[PDB]
Amino acid sequence: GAVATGEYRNLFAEIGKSEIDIQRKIDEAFQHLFYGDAKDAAVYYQAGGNENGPLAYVYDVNSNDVRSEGMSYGMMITVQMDKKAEFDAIWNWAKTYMYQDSPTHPAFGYFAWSMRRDGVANDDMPAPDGEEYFVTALYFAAARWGNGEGIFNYQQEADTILSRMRHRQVITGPTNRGVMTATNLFHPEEAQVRFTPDINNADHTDASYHLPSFYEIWARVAPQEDRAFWAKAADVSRDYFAKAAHPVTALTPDYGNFDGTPWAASWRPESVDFRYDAWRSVMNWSMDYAWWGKDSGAPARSDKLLAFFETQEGKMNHLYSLDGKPLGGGPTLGLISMNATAAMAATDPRWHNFVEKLWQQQPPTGQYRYYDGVLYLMALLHCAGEYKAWIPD
Ligand SMILES: O[C@@H]1[C@@H](O)[C@H](O[C@@H]2CO[C@@H](O[C@@H]3CO[C@@H](O)[C@H](O)[C@H]3O)[C@H](O)[C@H]2O)OC[C@H]1O
């Protein structure tokens, strides 16, 4: 795997692109999304400063809010690209406005998943994929830049958050939504990430939240007492993808049960289909395979997904039933980007076409540019061999 060797595959180079052009493409993407036109191109916004210095947020234009997903993706992209100033401003904003520090609040230790741009929470509860990316990006920051102090003690912050993700007790208390009860973010017996710690829907998961690539990092650098738990979560997620992904298409549902079956949320029953969340599953298993080489099922799963999308040439939707019936929409940059990341594990040379498809894209503009753009930039980094495991001491 790439971590053992230190050699990350540059998939664009493998399909013939020059280093200079690959650098241009990444730099273009970053400049557009972080510094492009404020009304049409950017997702990064400077938001003044406080005692920790500059503040900035990643704007979910798609839904007119700031999400923990976006903030955590922003931190991952910026640490991968060695953009410490931007990283620190985003983290300051998350730690200042999103982080719940009150021990009598049910979200204690976590980050409010949906915020307004002025720092006011829409929902105090967390979205655990946010936390997963925050922790990992923080460990990567510690590896690349070393640890500062206070909120900038990246490794100490990571350790604390990750420990709490496992060990948080049940808390009932007031929130912006009324009294709520929430638990830990990983199920202790299943060793799987939850869809929500809200006790009302706590015993479910989401295949796109399974990040064995990252759990391997935690298994090496977390607080010693939790390392076996994270190693277990990595094994469990690999098995999870084998059960959750449809056997013909390798499409996964947005939401799931611990046993691998789709879960229909009462407020969103179409969560049993392959939609916006599930686009990311292939990236998660493919990254894991590329880095660690342990998911023996990943190459066949990536080949199946790409074979399926080849059948959709010229009529690609972006919403599907798990057996491959189109459920609406046209092609999106986000899905193109995610499908390209399947090339981190695929063996069939049709992968060349998916990587080439991502190469041909431009950065996104307009109202839906956030979800498209953050996936695009992450996919560009993966496919360029520039998204690495930065493992701290
Ligand atoms: O009370 C619980 C709610 O707080 C909970 O809200 C969900 C929290 O996560 C949201 O998902 C994020 C945004 O959409 C995806 O693309 C991201 O990957 C996630 O970070 C989800 O949409 C909210 O419904 O819902 C359940 C309640 O019990």
Q: What are the DSSP calls for 276-332, one per residue?
A: TTGGGHHHHHHHHHHHH---TTHHHHHHHHHHHHHHTTTS--SEE-TTS-EEE----
SS3 of 272, please?
A: helix
CA distance 312 to 259: 30
Tracing tokens 């009529």 back to the chain, one arrives at 315
**d(C-alpha 20, C-alpha 382), whole Å:** 17
Backbone angles phi, psi at 302, to 5 degrees: -60, -40
Q: Which method, experimentally, gave rise to this model? A: X-ray
Q: Is 159 in the pocket of ligand 1 (CB under 6 A)?
A: no
The residue among 118, 122, 65, 63 whose CA lies nearest residue 93 is 118
Q: Which atom of ligand 1 is nearest to the CA of 268?
A: 24
Determine which residue's CA is closest to atom 21 belonging to ligand 1: 127
Report the alpha-carbon distance of residue 343 to residue 99 in Å, rounded.
36
Is 181 close to ligand 1, i.e. is its CB under 6 Å away? Answer: no
The answer to whether the CB of 111 is under 6 A from ligand 1 is no
Taking CA 58 as the corner, what is the angle to CA 57 and CA 63, rounded to the nearest 5 degrees? 120
The verdict on the CB of residue 28 being under 6 Å from ligand 1 is: no
Our answer on whether the CB atom of 200 is closer than 6 Å to any ligand 1 atom is yes
Instruction: State in Å: Cα 71 to ligand 1 middle.
Output: 15
How far apart CA 130 and CA 197 sit, in angstroms, is 13
Instruction: Report how far residue 258's alpha carbon sits from residue 195's, in angstroms, rounded to the nearest whole number.
Output: 10
Choose the residue to mutate in 62, 67, 113 for probing ligand 1, maximizing ligand atoms within 8 Å of C-beta. Answer: 113
| Amino acid identity at 6 | G
CB-side neighbour CA atoms (13 Å) of 54: 12
In a domain, 393, yes or no: no
The reply to whether 391 falls in a domain is no
Resolution (A): 1.8
Please identify which residue in the block is written with the tokens 């080949």.
303
Q: What angle is formed at CA 49 by the lines to CA 48 and CA 55, rounded to 5 degrees?
A: 80
Nearest residue to 12 (alpha-carbon basis) of 370, 371, 358: 358
Give, using CA atoms, the residue closest to atom 23 of ligand 1: 127
What CATH number does the domain containing 233 carry? 1.50.10.10
CA–CA separation, 96 vs 89, rounded Å? 10
One-letter identity of residue 315: K
Does 392 reside within a domain? no
3 state SS of 264: coil
* CB-based contact 245:207 (threshold 8 Å): yes
From first CA to last CA, the distance across the chain in angstroms is 20
* Angle at alpha carbon of residue 3, lines to 376 and 74, rounded to 5°: 30
- Is residue 57 within 8 Å of 47, Cβ to Cβ? yes
Give the Cα separation of 102 and 109 in Å (integer): 8
Quote the CA–CA distance of 357 and 85 in Å, as a whole number: 32
Nearest residue to 159 via CA among 178, 177, 142: 142
Question: What is the distance in A from the centroid of ligand 1 to the CA of 358?
Answer: 28
Q: In the structure encoding, which two tokens stand for residue 222, read together? A: 């977390």
Q: What is the distance, to the nearest Å, from the Cα of residue 102 to the centroid of all Cα atoms in its chain?
A: 26
The length of the chain in residues reads 393
SS3 256: strand
Residue 306 lies in a domain: yes
Distance 127 CA to ligand 1 centre (A): 5
Question: What ligand 1 atom has the least distance to the C-alpha of 280?
Answer: 18
CB 138 within 8 A of CB 145: no
- Torsions phi, psi of 10, nearest 5? -100, 90
Strands 319-320 and 192-193: unpaired
| Side-chain half-sphere CA neighbours of 392 within 13 A | 25
**In which domain, by residue range, is 293 found?**
1-385
178, part of any domain: yes
C-beta of residue 43 within 8 angstroms of C-beta of residue 369: yes
- Indicate which residue's Cα is closest to atom 12 of ligand 1: 127
Cβ-based neighbour number of residue 176 at 10 Å: 14
Whether 116 is in a domain gets the answer: yes
d(CA 257, CA 244): 9
Top mutation candidate among 64, 66, 123, 319 for ligand 1, by most atoms within 8 Å of CB: 123
**To test ligand 1's pocket by mutation, which of 60, 75, 98, 196 has the most ligand atoms within 8 angstroms of CB?**
196
Residues with Cβ within 8 Å of residue 114, at least 6 apart in sequence: 65, 66, 67, 68, 121, 122, 123, 127
Give how many domains the chain has, as a whole number: 1
d(CA 57, CA 46): 7
DSSP-H helix ranges across the chain? 2-5, 11-14, 19-35, 68-80, 84-93, 128-145, 154-167, 212-221, 227-244, 281-292, 298-311, 333-341, 351-359, 369-383
Which residues are identified as catalytic? 69, 277
From its phi and psi, is residue 308 left (phi > 0), alpha (psi between -120 and 50) or beta?
Answer: alpha
196 lines ligand 1 (CB under 6 A): yes
Residue 288 counted as domain residue: yes
Q: Of the candidates 158, 163, 164, which has an alpha carbon nearest to the alpha carbon of residue 139?
A: 158
| Position 368 in a domain | yes
Half-sphere exposure of 347 (CA within 13 A, CB side): 7
Sign of CA dihedral 264, 180, 67, 109: negative
